[PDB]
Amino acid sequence: QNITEEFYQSTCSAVSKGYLSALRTGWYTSVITIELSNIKENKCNGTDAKVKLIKQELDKYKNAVTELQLLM
Amino acid sequence: QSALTQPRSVSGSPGQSVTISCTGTSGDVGTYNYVSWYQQLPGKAPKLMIYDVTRRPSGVPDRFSGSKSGNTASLTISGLQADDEADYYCCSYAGTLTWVFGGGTKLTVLGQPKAAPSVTLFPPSSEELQANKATLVCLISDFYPGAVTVAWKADSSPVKAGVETTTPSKQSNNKYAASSYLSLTPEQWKSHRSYSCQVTHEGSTVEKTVAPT
Amino acid sequence: QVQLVQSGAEVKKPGSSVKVSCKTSGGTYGTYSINWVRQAPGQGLEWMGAIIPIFGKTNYAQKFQGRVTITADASTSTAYMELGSLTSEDTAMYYCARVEDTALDHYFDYWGQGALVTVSSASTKGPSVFPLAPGTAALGCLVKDYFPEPVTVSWNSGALTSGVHTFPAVLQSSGLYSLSSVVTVPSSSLGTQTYICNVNHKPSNTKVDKRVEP
Amino acid sequence: FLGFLLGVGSAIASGVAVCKVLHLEGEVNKIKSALLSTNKAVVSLSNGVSVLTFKVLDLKNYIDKQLLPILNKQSCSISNIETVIEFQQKNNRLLEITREFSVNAGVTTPVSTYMLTNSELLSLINDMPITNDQKKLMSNNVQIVRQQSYSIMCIIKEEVLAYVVQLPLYGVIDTPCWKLHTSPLCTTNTKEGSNICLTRTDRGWYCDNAGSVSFFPQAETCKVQSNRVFCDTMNSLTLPSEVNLCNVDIFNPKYDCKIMTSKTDVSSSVITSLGAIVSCYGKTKCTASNKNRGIIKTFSNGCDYVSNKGVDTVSVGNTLYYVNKQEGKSLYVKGEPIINFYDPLVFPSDEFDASISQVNEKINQSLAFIRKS
DSSP, X not given: OOXXXXXXXXXXXXXXXXXXXXXXXXXXXXXXXXXXOOOOOOOOOOOSHHHHHXXXXXXXXXXXXXXXXXXX | OOOBBOOSEEOOOSXXXXXXXXXXXXXXTTSOOOEEEEEEOTTSOOXXXXXXXXXXXXXXXXXXXXXXXXXXXXXXXXXXXXXXXXXEEEEEEEETTEEEEBOOEEEOOSOOOOOOOEEEEEOOOHHHHTTTOEEEEEEEEEEOSSOOEEEEXXXXXXXXXXXXXXXXXXXXXXXEEEEEEEEEOHHHHTTOSOEEEEEEETTXXXXXXXXXX | OOOEEEOOOEEEOTTSEEEEEEEESOOTTOOOEEEEEEOOSSSSOOEEEEEETTTTEEEEOXXXXXXXXXXXXXTTTEEEEEEESOOGGGOEEEEEEEESOTTTOOSOXXXXXXXXXXXXXXXXXXXXXXXEOOOOEEEEEEEEEESOSOEEEEEXXXXXXXXXXXXXXXXXXXXXXXXXXXXXXXXXXXHHSOOEEEEEXXXXXXXXXXXXXX | OOGGGOOOOOSSHHHHHHHHHHTSTTHHHHHHHHHTTSSEEEEEOTTSOEEEEEEEEEXXXXXXXXXXXXXXXXXXXXXXXXXXXXXXXTTHHHHHHHHHHHHHTTEESSXXXXXXXXXXXXXXXXXXXXXXXXXXXXXXXXHHHHHTOEEEEEEEETTEEEXXXXXXXXXXXXXXXXXXXXOOEEOOOSOSSOOOEEEEOOOEEEEEETTEEEEEOSGGGOEEOSSOXXXXXXXXXXXXXXXXXXXXXXXXXXXXOEEEEEOOOOOEEEEOSSEEEEEEOTTOOEEEEOSSSSEEEEOOSEEEEEETXXXXXXXXXXXXXXXXXXXXXXXXXXXXOGGGGSOTTTSOSOEEXXXXXXXXXXXXXXHHXXXXX
């Protein structure tokens, strides 16, 4: 059972009984933190492919931090 | 929001560890582990050697080691050298775009050899005499003991009028400098035979003589 | 590589205002904040304020609240500062420093050479220079009886740097200073090399080039 | 149809308050000192409010200890390529958070897996000031929990990126609910015109709530699991329980039921939980069909009903309708249609949100005004 339904031909309407509830009453807030450090002006050659890839990722990290600061 | 309290001066001979304390309130330090020490060679903007509670930047010797404990910091230098001569400046994060500065500690090493002063005297040139003016210039340099004393002697007779004297200032070679000006009229200059600039240095007096010729 | 230029030094009168600029040459468009610090002759620097040019956000210390307004032009990447109602207590060497990222860094990393602001009552007076003719030898130029205290000496417009030594100023009893500079040169080069001193006076727009003839 | 009867409210203000608190001078330092030991902690802010503080990603502990002691060791040339992948990881999530907050402007209404991973959300639920029943409900319907929870970017300063994840509480739980479906009820007179239509406008959800009825007209606020009905009372009306009487006896003296009058001879189909209502009017085709036995019913003109048992399709006009194939017992309450109680010339021809009492009052007005002549 646990889901019954009625059709009221009188008023041309149906009612679906048997449903339980979970009503949003209020809210709960929690602070989620990400701890970030700084890559401050590391100077090193970009000739090697591996180091060039590292720099491609370092720039992404720095730009992500700066953009997070900008959007406010 | 007052400045921090630092010892006015410490010192140490080469081969010794020196610790400089930096004390602040609960807001400046104790709460934020964001401290920074700066050195200043007089005549140039500062340059830091500690960029966190215990972190040093790129190009800083390992002998520099900082710490902090309950509103008091500790900048430690191991194996002092003749290069670590500057005014150290403790700084601390205090809040959103607010930093507090320390009163500054003055670290000058005890171990350093004496150097005889190199004196040079200059007479007034033609352009100054053609304008009714005359100024004798005595330039001292490369004397390590800060104590120097100038005394002008006109024909072995002391002059007590118009003599000016600078303050011993640090140089790029860590050996001090000085300067002295004696002002006199053109008739007071062309009426004598020999002037003298006597610079006393640890007893050793270095002299220079000029003449109207 | 990355650095920031700084305006020249100037002189005002007690009650006027001094506007000091600070242009940077690094860029990176980051959330860097320019900090102003005017030490003194007296020991110890003094943190004045800060500004993030990308946002225009400012915050001044409580010692100078209501007295200084720090600005920054974002098009030319230049950060100004204007201190009105000057007093002789506000005479100092106004430096200019930055921090890399406002949220990641909490310490100054790069500075500027700085300007010098003197505010007194006596009138300004452009200096007078006279030459001084001479192992080796020694010649130089002398600068005397000026009111300001920025005076820079240069030789051969940047082609002679070794052996040069400029001494700090004296305080003549007339309230004016006096400066000197010396250069060590070989013996035989006095007859062939022409030696010219360059004293570029900043506060009184004076540029005098004296030729010291051996 | 009562959707415009609702009052307006703020959906994220409870998180903006925590953000305004986090913007205080010594606030983020407290949280950082608290998380200096573990990943999660309880933090009493400077306003007395106690919050949960979760450190989901520590890059400083990676940067200043493993990566930068390699790049800044000396001689930048790295030996192995593993560092590139180790830094692509632990940074992909920060890049994704930046990319999400760039296009969403501070508040994302579904908390994405990058804002809060599933295991992290389950741990947060397990360590919340809620009962075991609510904990299990959220743990089993994490998806719906994400549907009703916001994530407000809060602050980034002092080497700490902060954002408050504001979750639903589900105060009312396990109180029985019911869904009310409606379809137009019109007379089947042989005339081409002058055909009246009555409908019920109270369609939606109804739930027991502190002796009253929380009624949701906007079906978006309520997600539906197997038998659980998640709803959001921010867009809900509060009625007396006697509104339920409108199901069994629409002419009761307790609650004045809400209806709608019209004069539109158009057929419609209303799919219900375990069946289908078909209002078949005019020459419109109405066919209840099955996947095996082809067609099983042709609807007579009027408002009829079929159960999802054996019925696989309801087609009205060119409109197809797949019936919901969930088990359950349907019941057909036989009774005369209500539309046969009124007269065509007295029935109000146009009144959008009417009621039994209001329609009767307009009938009284019209009848009196006509009879007084």
